[PDB]
Amino acid sequence: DDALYSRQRYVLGDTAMQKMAKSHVFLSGMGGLGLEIAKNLVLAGIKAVTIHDTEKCQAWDLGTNFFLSEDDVVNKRNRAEAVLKHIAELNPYVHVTSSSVPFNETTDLSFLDKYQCVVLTEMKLPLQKKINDFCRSQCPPIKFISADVHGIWSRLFCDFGDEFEVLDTTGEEPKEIFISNITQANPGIVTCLENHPHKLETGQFLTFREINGMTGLNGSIQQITVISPFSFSIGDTTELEPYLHGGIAVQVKTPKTVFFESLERQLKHPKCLIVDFSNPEAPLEIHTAMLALDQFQEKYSRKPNVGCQQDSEELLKLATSISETLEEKPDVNADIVHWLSWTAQGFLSPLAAAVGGVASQEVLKAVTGKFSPLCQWLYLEAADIVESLGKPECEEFLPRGDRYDALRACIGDTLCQKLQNLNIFLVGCGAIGCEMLKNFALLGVGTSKEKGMITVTDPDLIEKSNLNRQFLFRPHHIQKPKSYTAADATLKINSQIKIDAHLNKVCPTTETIYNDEFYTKQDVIITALDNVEARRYVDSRCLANLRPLLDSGTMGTKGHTEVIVPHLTESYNSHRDPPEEEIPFATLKSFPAAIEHTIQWARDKFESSFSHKPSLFNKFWQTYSSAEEVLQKIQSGHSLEGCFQVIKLLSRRPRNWSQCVELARLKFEKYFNHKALQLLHCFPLDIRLKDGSLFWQSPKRPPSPIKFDLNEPLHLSFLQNAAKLYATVYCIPFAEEDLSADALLNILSEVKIQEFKPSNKVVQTDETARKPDHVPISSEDERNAIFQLEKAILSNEATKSDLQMAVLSFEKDDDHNGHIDFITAASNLRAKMYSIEPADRFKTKRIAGKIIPAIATTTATVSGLVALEMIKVTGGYPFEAYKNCFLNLAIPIVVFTETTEVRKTKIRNGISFTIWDRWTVHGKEDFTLLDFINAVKEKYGIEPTMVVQGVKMLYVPVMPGHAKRLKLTMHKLVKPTTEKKYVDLTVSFAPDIDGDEDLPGPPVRYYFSHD
Amino acid sequence: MHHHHHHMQIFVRTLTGRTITLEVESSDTIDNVRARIQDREGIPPDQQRLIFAGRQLEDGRTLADYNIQRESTLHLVLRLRGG
Ligand SMILES: O=P(O)(O)O[C@H]1[C@H](OP(=O)(O)O)[C@@H](OP(=O)(O)O)[C@H](OP(=O)(O)O)[C@@H](OP(=O)(O)O)[C@H]1OP(=O)(O)O
Ligand SMILES: *O=P([O])([O])O[C][C]1O[C](N2[C]=NC3=C2N=[C]N=C3[N])[C]([O])[C]1[O]
């Protein structure tokens, strides 16, 4: 619908968005978890949300609620009504209402049938079951979600009714398969193109098109059985005509039905999503413990008290009795029960952040039918935060009357103060970065008076389309810096927070700012970036300075977190990400097969016509001054680079608006008519190769010329936008009345169209061609350039105004500049020329603009998970406590896993090193190179055979005469001035087997004196 | 003494609902499994991150070293670039 919804429209699709524009969600309980959910839903664009709560504000709530203020507490405002205006501001298209009416077991639940989904937090279990029974039995069922965080534990439950239709189960687009052969048999066997496995699984359904020969399969649906990576069987083809060539098969996506059971029944036979397959039995063990807590609250009307031995013994007894009533008779996990009784009255905000993201995506699934919902329980937990504590005393967990009581009751005061003392470096300040700053604020990061500081940096100003997933930015913040605005907002959440906001990007050209001393001062670096290059760069800096790094990322419903800890793990750069897709040169230029190929071609044509060529033109005449000088230098045998292309542009320069339309008309004829005729001249429709096969075999598609017709809206759109862009480049003023179809037809009415003339130009067919480098200039071309250069000088068409052009910059998010409209028209005209299915403007924009789909739900989820890992880094936890996470909420699937174990590289004699090792030798003034060699051997066990300083070869014994360098002092050998203190050297060693290459060791830092 | 050869079938699942069924030997290295996945998917080994039972599988080790058995499930995971 809107430019506010652009990035997330690509996640959900237009059909799902429209259902969200008609949905009313009821959310009860506005503690920390309800607030997170409400924030996500309003950002995602649910049309109406009612936030319900019956409780007054309390000082404790300031620790878990990022919209509450101390003024709310002194006035004892209702929790839902206090945050209502802050939530409403997240986007004024959403209707946010508050309710504070009582809500108990005598309440008539009929008012709930106004809602499509009900979300319940902080609600007693008996009432949950009563509401669940009501919801699931409505004539259309009201979808039901229950979610809670207690201390370091959480519970998420979905019940979308007896039969729920999922319209798209995976969120993945149907793949296309090219057919190579089909046999006449029962069953018939399909073979796909060589070197392209079909990647299909038995049972999937396919449709077919463009098969030549075997008439009867086109337009049919076939269920396949995989035979090999390249072949599968379909139906009976014995009676059909023989297969000749061609054919494309497309996966059909079938709607699926999911069955849900009541909360009451699911409590006794729970279906749990397994998020850590090292402990597949843990979710049922948590289910048991958390049901015991509900029974404790019902029996005693309170939660257990920390340190009260009788309370935890009772919770264990309830847990033990529940376990006997379950089907498997699962042993009770006494550790889970103990830590649940310990922390029950606390509340872990980053866990609520993560649960709130998942639960919000589940609400979206409930009202759209997009993606397969959770079925039916999720038990995200933060046990890895406390296991290292052992069994501490409870004094450290008791409330102290500050905003950190909720957190302290989870992790203890020692760890809280370590968080308050953190220096952390937050790189990037967009969607993830805004969620991180809010998570830091609730944790107290960097609030200590003594130590502690959040440094956040981002080079960007705030724009529209950022207010979707970045909840700290408002429309009145447009043109304000992201880092400054987010910093100011975080201070409102927590007034003790100390933040230093920069306007820089972290890259090689700012390494003098973010130098080694800067990283050494940080405790942890956290990335919130939108590209792989920045991630690998920051990683190289953290590795060089022995600092931990927490990375994360999203794409739509997909997300990851990665933990990098010195001496414990590998770093980010130990793995490679998928590169940008490389469309082969010949495919892009001559033989497109997909709409992606014509979109890239249109994007490249915009860049060539309106950016690259104008700037080459400008730089050429800036370098060579005037046309008379270039003419004199060409006739004297000199050759200037790009000269012939410049003169062509000079001679064809349009002088008025009319000539801009004529140029645009000429380009239409070249791109969408002549190109087709030229390829057919080189490769006639029926031309064959030496092997007797057709040249126009899949994936190649023959072009067909297009006849220009101003009555075609696609042709008019091309002519309009091409003409106005050429008018911009050539500085020709134009009014919007000159763009009318009537005004355009008159300008072209008496303009002759040049008939097509073929050439014997060679067109590359190799899929590994990669540009023809540079063709040498011909004798005819130089002769034609001189003719055009003289013709421009004689007719005074080479003045100063003629020697410059305006350079455009591709801007995807301004609809009035015509950039996207030009690309869409050019791409779809080229697609029609090749009988490729066109794409609408929104799809073309996504692909041309390299836009990455994003939704606040995933963003909030991975940010909560990163904050949990940051607590572990703060505490110096062991390797086993850390978790990477790889997730896709579309499925849903969550894979926690231990992070990458640090690897050992063997030097020799059992001596190994890791990426984190750095060796040091401390010399004195008379310390020689021989001293250095002996010092390395004595300290580290092996003698160096090579010493290098960058590219300077300090000592290479195999080079003639280097033995004399052993007696030289290290001062005279190195010659230092930039770093007075030390020099960083590269040291190598003799290999195990003689004659092989010397083995590199850790970097070695040599200190010239003892200081 | 040398053991009997133990052939097995394992499943490599993506996080997008796909399943790759692999015919392997228990003595296969993790390196060899990445090569087989490259043959089936076109994914270069240095882009493949494989998770089994909450641990990340590394080169230089065998399926048996990781206690991977008949009908075991591995997950093929990726890092995302948005933020
Ligand atoms: O610079 P490019 O973006 O790579 O486009 C060029 C350019 O076409 P346009 O400038 O009209 O957009 C050439 O025309 P000139 O400006 O050099 O006169 C044209 O050459 P011909 O007109 O002689 O065919 C050539 O096409 P080709 O290489 O098939 O000869 C075509 O290349 P692309 O459109 O494929 O990029
Ligand atoms: O994902 P979002 O677009 O919401 O935020 C990404 C954010 O990262 C910033 N960024 C990109 N590259 C950077 C960087 N910050 C600091 N250093 C480097 N190299 C970008 O400005 C976005 O706002």
**Which ligand sits nearest to residue A617's alpha carbon?**
1
Residue B83 lies in a domain: no
From atom 17 of ligand 2, which residue's Cα is the shortest distance away?
A505
CA dihedral A167, A115, A269, A103 (to 10 degrees): 170
Residue B41 sits in a domain whose CATH number is: 3.10.20.90
Name the minimum distance, in Å, from the CA of A970 to any CA of chain B: 41
- Helix, strand, coil content of chain A in percent (nearest 5): 40, 15, 45
Gap from B54 CA to chain A (nearest CA, Å): 4
Q: Which residues of chain A have a CB within 8 Å of the CB of B47? A: 575-578
Determine the length of chain B. 83
The C-alpha of A65 sits at a distance from chain B's nearest C-alpha, in angstroms, of: 24
Name the residue of A505, A572, A852 to mutate for ligand 2: max ligand atoms within 8 A of Cβ: A505
Whether the CB of A596 is below 8 Å from some CB of chain B: the reply is no
CB contact under 8 A, A554 and B80: yes
Which residues of chain B neighbour A575 with C-beta distances below 8 Å? 46-47, 49, 79
**Best residue among A425, A473, A530, A533 to mutate for probing ligand 2, ranked by most atoms within 8 Å of CB:** A530
CA distance to A355, A565, A846, per residue, from A358 (Å): 5, 27, 26
Method: X-ray
A888 neighbourhood in chain B, CB within 8 Å: 15-16
Tell me whether residue B40 is in a domain.
yes
Closest approach of B77 to chain A, Cα-based (Å): 6
For residue A908, the SS3 value is: strand
**Substitution site in A608, A616, A756 for ligand 1 pocket (most atoms within 8 Å of beta carbon):** A608
Residue A553 CA to residue A114 CA, distance in Å, equals 37
Residue A898: which of B15, B39, B56 has the nearest Cβ?
B56
Beta carbons within 8 Å of A162's beta carbon, 6+ residues apart = A136, A141, A259, A260
Q: Which residue has the tokens 């939108």?
A: A530
Q: What contacts A659, CB < 8 A, 6 or more positions away?
A: none
Ligand positioned closest to the Cα atom of A470: 2
DSSP output for A380-391 = -B-GGGTGGG-S
- Distance, in Å, from the CA atom of A430 to the CA atom of A219, rounded to the nearest integer, reads 47
Ligand that comes closest to the CA of residue A436: 2
Q: Where are the alpha helices (DSSP H) in A21-116?
A: 32-44, 70-74, 79-88
Give the integer Cα–Cα distance in Å for B2 and B24: 19
Nearest CA to ligand 1 atom 33: A589
Residue B27 within any structural domain of the chain: yes
Segments in A196-281 forming alpha helices (H) = 263-268
Between A and B, how many residue pairs show a Cβ–Cβ distance under 8 A? 111
The neighbour count for residue A186, using CB atoms within 10 Å, is 11
Q: Do B15 and A199 touch (CB under 8 A)?
A: no
Torsional sign, CA A214, A216, A221, A223: negative
Give the count of domains, chain B: 1
CB A700 within 8 A of CB A591: yes
Cα-to-centroid distance, A552 and ligand 2 (Å) = 13
Please tell me if the CB atom of residue B83 comes closer than 6 angstroms to any atom of ligand 2.
yes
Residue B38 in domain: yes
Q: How far apart are the first and last CA of chain B?
A: 55
DSSP3 helix / strand / coil % (chain B, rounded to 5)? 20, 35, 45
Cβ pair B81:A532 closer than 8 A: yes
What is the residue range of A189's domain? 176-258
How far, in Å, CA of A152 to CA of A385, rounded?
Answer: 8
A562 lines ligand 2 (CB under 6 A): no
Using the beta-carbon criterion (under 8 Å), do B16 and A528 form an inter-chain contact? Answer: no
CATH number of the domain within which A207 lies: 2.40.30.180
Q: Could you tell me the residue range of the domain that residue B69 belongs to?
A: 7-77
CB A150 within 8 A of CB A410: no
Given the structure tokens 């379909």, which residue do they identify? A234
CA-nearest of A330, A328, A289 to A312 is A289
d(CA A462, ligand 2 centre) in Å: 11
A563 neighbors A584 (Cβ within 8 angstroms): no
The DSSP bridge pattern shows strands A248-252 and A176-182 to be antiparallel
Question: In three state form, how does the secondary structure of A148-173 look?
Answer: EEEECEEEEEEECCCEEEECECCCCC
Q: Output the 3-class SS for A95-142.
A: EEEEECCCCCCCCCHHHHHHCCEEEECCCCHHHHHHHHHHHHCCCCCC
- Resolution of the experimental structure, in angstroms: 2.3
The answer to whether the peptide bond before residue A699 is cis (omega within 30 degrees of 0) is yes
Say which ligand is closest to the CA of A830: 1
Partner-chain contact B16 A171, CB within 8 Å: yes
> Is A358:A333 a contact under the CB 8 Å cutoff?
no
Q: How far apart are CA A162 and CA A141, in angstroms?
A: 8
Q: How far apart are CA A34 and CA A121, in angstroms?
A: 6
**Chain A partners of B51 at a C-beta cutoff of 8 Å?**
886, 895, 897
Please tell me the distance from the alpha carbon of residue A917 to that of residue A951, in angstroms, as a whole number. Answer: 21
**Closest approach of A462 to chain B, Cα-based (Å):** 15
Per CB-CB distance under 8 Å, the chain B contacts of A853 are 82
The structure tokens 């009537």 sit at: A742
Residues with Cβ within 8 Å of A247's Cβ and at least 6 positions away in sequence, in order, are: A178, A179, A182, A208, A209, A210, A211, A212, A217, A698
Q: Considering only the beta carbons, identify the residue of A171, A551, A852 that sits closest to B82.
A: A852
Given the CA of residue A457, which atom of ligand 2 is nearest to it? 16
Residue B2 within a domain: no
Kindly list the residues from chain A whose CB atom is less than 8 angstroms away from the CB atom of residue B78: 558, 560, 577-578, 886
DSSP E strands: which ranges in A237-383? Answer: 248-252, 256-259, 377-378
Q: CB neighbours (10 Å) of residue A81? A: 16
From residue A357, give the alpha-carbon distance in Å to each of A44, A352, A519: 11, 8, 31
Interface of A with B in 815-844 (CB under 8 A): none
**Shortest-distance atom of ligand 1 to CA A589:** 35
A117-120/A163-166 β-pairing: unpaired
Is residue A427 lining ligand 2, measured as CB closer than 6 Å? yes
**Which of A558, A425, A415, A437 has the alpha carbon at shortest distance from A486?**
A437
Element (H, E) at B76: strand B73-77
Residue B82 lies in a domain: no
Q: Would you call B41 and A551 a contact, using CB atoms and an 8 Å cutoff? A: no
The C-alpha atoms of residue A90 and residue A349 are separated, in whole angstroms, by 20
Query: What length is written for chain A?
Result: 1011
Contacts of B67 in chain A (CB under 8 A): none
- Please give the distance, rounded to the nearest whole angstrom, from the Cα atom of residue A90 to the centre of ligand 1: 49
Judging contacts by C-beta atoms under 8 Å, the chain A residues touching residue B17 are 169-170, 172, 891
- CB A507 near ligand 2, within 6 Å: yes
The 10 Å Cβ neighbour count of residue A677 is: 14
Q: CB A530 to CB B81 under 8 A?
A: yes
Q: Do A891 and B16 touch (CB under 8 A)?
A: yes
Name the nearest CA neighbour of A91 among A50, A23, A18, A39: A39
Nearest-ligand number for the alpha carbon of A863: 2
Give first-to-last CA distance, chain A, whole Å.
65
What tokens appear for A598 in the block? 């014509």
Say how far residue A386 (Cα) sits from the centre of its chain: 31
Find out whether the beta carbon of A430 lies less than 6 Å from any atom of ligand 2.
Answer: yes
Decide if B37 is inside a domain. yes
Q: What single string gives the DSSP state of each residue in A433-476?
A: HHHHHHHHHHHTTT--SSS-EEEEE--PBP-TTSTTT-TT--GG
Indicate whether B39 belongs to any domain. Answer: yes
Closest to A845 in 3D by CA, of A595, A673, A623, A645: A595
Name all residues whose Cβ lies below 6 A of ligand 1.
A 589, 605, 608-609, 648, 667, 670, 761
A242 upstream amide cis, omega within 30 of 0: no
Helix H or strand E segment including A946: strand A944-949
Please tell me the distance from the alpha carbon of residue A591 to that of residue A968, in angstroms, as a whole number: 65
- DSSP category for residue A495: T
Helix (H) or strand (E) holding A365: helix A349-368
- Which protein residue has the closest C-alpha to ligand 2 atom 18? A505
